Amino acid sequence: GKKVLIVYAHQEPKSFNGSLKNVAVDELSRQGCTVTVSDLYAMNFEPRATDKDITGTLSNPEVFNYGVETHEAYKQRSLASDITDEQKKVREADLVIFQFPLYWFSVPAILKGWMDRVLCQGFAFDIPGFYDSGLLQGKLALLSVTTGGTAEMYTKTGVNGDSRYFLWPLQHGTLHFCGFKVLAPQISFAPEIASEEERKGMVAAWSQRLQTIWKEEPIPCTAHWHFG
Amino acid sequence: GKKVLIVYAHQEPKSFNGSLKNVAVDELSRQGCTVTVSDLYAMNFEPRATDKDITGTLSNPEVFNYGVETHEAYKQRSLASDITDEQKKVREADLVIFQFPLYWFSVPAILKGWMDRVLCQGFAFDIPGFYDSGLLQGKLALLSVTTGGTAEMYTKTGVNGDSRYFLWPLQHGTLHFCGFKVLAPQISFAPEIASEEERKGMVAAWSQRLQTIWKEEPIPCTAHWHF
Ligand SMILES: Cc1cc2nc3c(=O)[nH]c(=O)nc-3n(C[C@H](O)[C@H](O)[C@H](O)COP(=O)(O)OP(=O)(O)OC[C@H]3O[C@@H](n4cnc5c(N)ncnc54)[C@H](O)[C@@H]3O)c2cc1C
Ligand SMILES: Cc1cc2nc3c(=O)[nH]c(=O)nc-3n(C[C@H](O)[C@H](O)[C@H](O)COP(=O)(O)OP(=O)(O)OC[C@H]3O[C@@H](n4cnc5c(N)ncnc54)[C@H](O)[C@@H]3O)c2cc1C
Ligand SMILES: COc1cc2nc(N3CCN(C(=O)c4ccco4)CC3)nc(N)c2cc1OC
Ligand SMILES: COc1cc2nc(N3CCN(C(=O)c4ccco4)CC3)nc(N)c2cc1OC
Ligand SMILES: [Zn+2]
Numbered sequence A: 001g002k003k004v005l006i007v008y009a010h011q012e013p014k015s016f017n018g019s020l021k022n023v024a025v026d027e028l029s030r031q032g033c034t035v036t037v038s039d040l041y042a043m044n045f046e047p048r049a050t051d052k053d054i055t056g057t058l059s060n061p062e063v064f065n066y067g068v069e070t071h072e073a074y075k076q077r078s079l080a081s082d083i084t085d086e087q088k089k090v091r092e093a094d095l096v097i098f099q100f101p102l103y104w105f106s107v108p109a110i111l112k113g114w115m116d117r118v119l120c121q122g123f124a125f126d127i128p129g130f131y132d133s134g135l136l137q138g139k140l141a142l143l144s145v146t147t148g149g150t151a152e153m154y155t156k157t158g159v160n161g162d163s164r165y166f167l168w169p170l171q172h173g174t175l176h177f178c179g180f181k182v183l184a185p186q187i188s189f190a191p192e193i194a195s196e197e198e199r200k201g202m203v204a205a206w207s208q209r210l211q212t213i214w215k216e217e218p219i220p221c222t223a224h225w226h227f228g
Numbered sequence B: 001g002k003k004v005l006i007v008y009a010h011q012e013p014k015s016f017n018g019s020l021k022n023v024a025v026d027e028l029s030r031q032g033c034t035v036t037v038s039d040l041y042a043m044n045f046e047p048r049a050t051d052k053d054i055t056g057t058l059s060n061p062e063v064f065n066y067g068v069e070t071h072e073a074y075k076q077r078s079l080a081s082d083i084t085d086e087q088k089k090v091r092e093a094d095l096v097i098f099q100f101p102l103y104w105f106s107v108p109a110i111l112k113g114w115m116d117r118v119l120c121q122g123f124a125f126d127i128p129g130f131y132d133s134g135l136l137q138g139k140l141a142l143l144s145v146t147t148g149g150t151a152e153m154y155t156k157t158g159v160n161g162d163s164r165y166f167l168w169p170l171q172h173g174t175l176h177f178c179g180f181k182v183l184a185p186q187i188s189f190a191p192e193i194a195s196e197e198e199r200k201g202m203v204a205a206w207s208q209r210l211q212t213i214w215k216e217e218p219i220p221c222t223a224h225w226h227f
């Protein structure tokens, strides 16, 4: 028995991202997995890292330091409940899938805020207690990303460089840092450009990949994998 | 005369980032430059890309495509005023400095939202206006970043890898894509582990570099430079 959290960042249910999220839910549900979706836009999820994220007495009220104050708030249980709600979902999950359109070679800001606010020190990592010693060790993570650019454009000799270059901050700097084993990303290239058959193909490839997701090995989340 | 925009993303005026922003203001002001600051947290800047970003009625209110709708709204002068306020500052600027602490090998979400919302198709880029021909060509951009990790931690065979690895999505994927010439980043490594005198010295060095900022050449913003 397995628990899956899908962190989903798209404004439009009828979008290609919406379809990818829906087939994920359908297929994991069919397998008998426990499935939860955090639909960040529908939740109006707060992306800003602010002093509103701590409800208790601040450790240093004269000079506000977000990292210091959230680490302390986590230990004291004085974090805002929207953060601790998300942390519960992550804690219980065996696999976390991020479903999002690529925005400026990265996640949309609303999802960036989820990373900034939910993955605090004490919960997701400590110093020491990061990368292979990260606190979310034992969990799997997977990026399911859609692009405007074609696969052509995302090659080493294309304008945008290889797709793996833009994965580094997310796969390594965030997920690996927190101790996740990272599964190979699912990149669905340029669905707005693609034909009807090509889009249906991309949806079914994801659906089909999910059938055997629990048999996959993680990537070696290293500089060499990303950059060669 | 030169116009500079500083897009600043820290919650605390007394912070190390705050000090770096303040010396940039002081030094560029001393030089006679026109200086504007967008203090994102103080503005409570909206980071979410939503249909609220378009005023009046939408191009296709059945299926919402942010990219399409904001491109159309830009062309039809129908974007929310927080966005168009920022676009005016960017249009008039000769240099845009981004002052921020590194969050997860990237910009804080509030700053990511400025990028997502302000740099829309029609304003910052178009077909064929991207990279070398991007719509903001002729402008300079500069990332001034503070980190938790020391410089040693950010070496090519360090835990965190090379600094330039994380710069790629920001410098190339974003700024170069819009046509900016990118100046070398100012990276202020690990202010929190001090010393109080060593912090003084990083602030001073940023100020010193700003003295000759207009003489500098842009980096070659290529896969090669970063990797
Ligand atoms: C601020 C911003 C920054 C961006 N930065 C980048 C960037 O840095 N690099 C880059 O490459 N791109 C970038 N993009 C482009 C962006 O990544 C794409 O527009 C997005 O990935 C497309 O996914 P979508 O779900 O919105 O597509 P949609 O427009 O929703 O889908 C395309 C088509 O697929 C159809 N569809 C939906 N479901 C199905 C289904 N079940 N079967 C068949 N068809 C279906 C839809 O009806 C639609 O016609 C950026 C976009 C924005 C707005
Ligand atoms: C969500 C999150 C994600 C993060 N992700 C990363 C990451 O991926 N990689 C990484 O390396 N780090 C990361 N960090 C750490 C972060 O980048 C550092 O905490 C930050 O850059 C420190 O900058 P600051 O301005 O807040 O320092 P401050 O705490 O504000 O500065 C340190 C000291 O400088 C003092 N000071 C202020 N002005 C001056 C002055 N002019 N002269 C002398 N001293 C002065 C202050 O009083 C303070 O004591 C993350 C932090 C958070 C909260
Ligand atoms: C090559 O890399 C990039 C590609 C991008 N594509 C788009 N779109 C989204 C909409 N498209 C369409 O097919 C389209 C046409 C009509 C309706 O929809 C593709 C262009 N928007 C961006 N902001 C991009 C940024 C990039 O690099 C930073
Ligand atoms: C190696 O790369 C990383 C370094 C990090 N350092 C910190 N600090 C900054 C240094 N601190 C301090 O001296 C300190 C101690 C007490 C108060 O302040 C706080 C933790 N916080 C993060 N979130 C980091 C994330 C990283 O990679 C994703
Ligand atoms: Zn890694």
Ligand SMILES: [Zn+2]
Residues within 6 Å of the ligand: B171, B172, B173, B176, B177, B220, B221, B222, B223
């Ligand atoms: Zn470049």
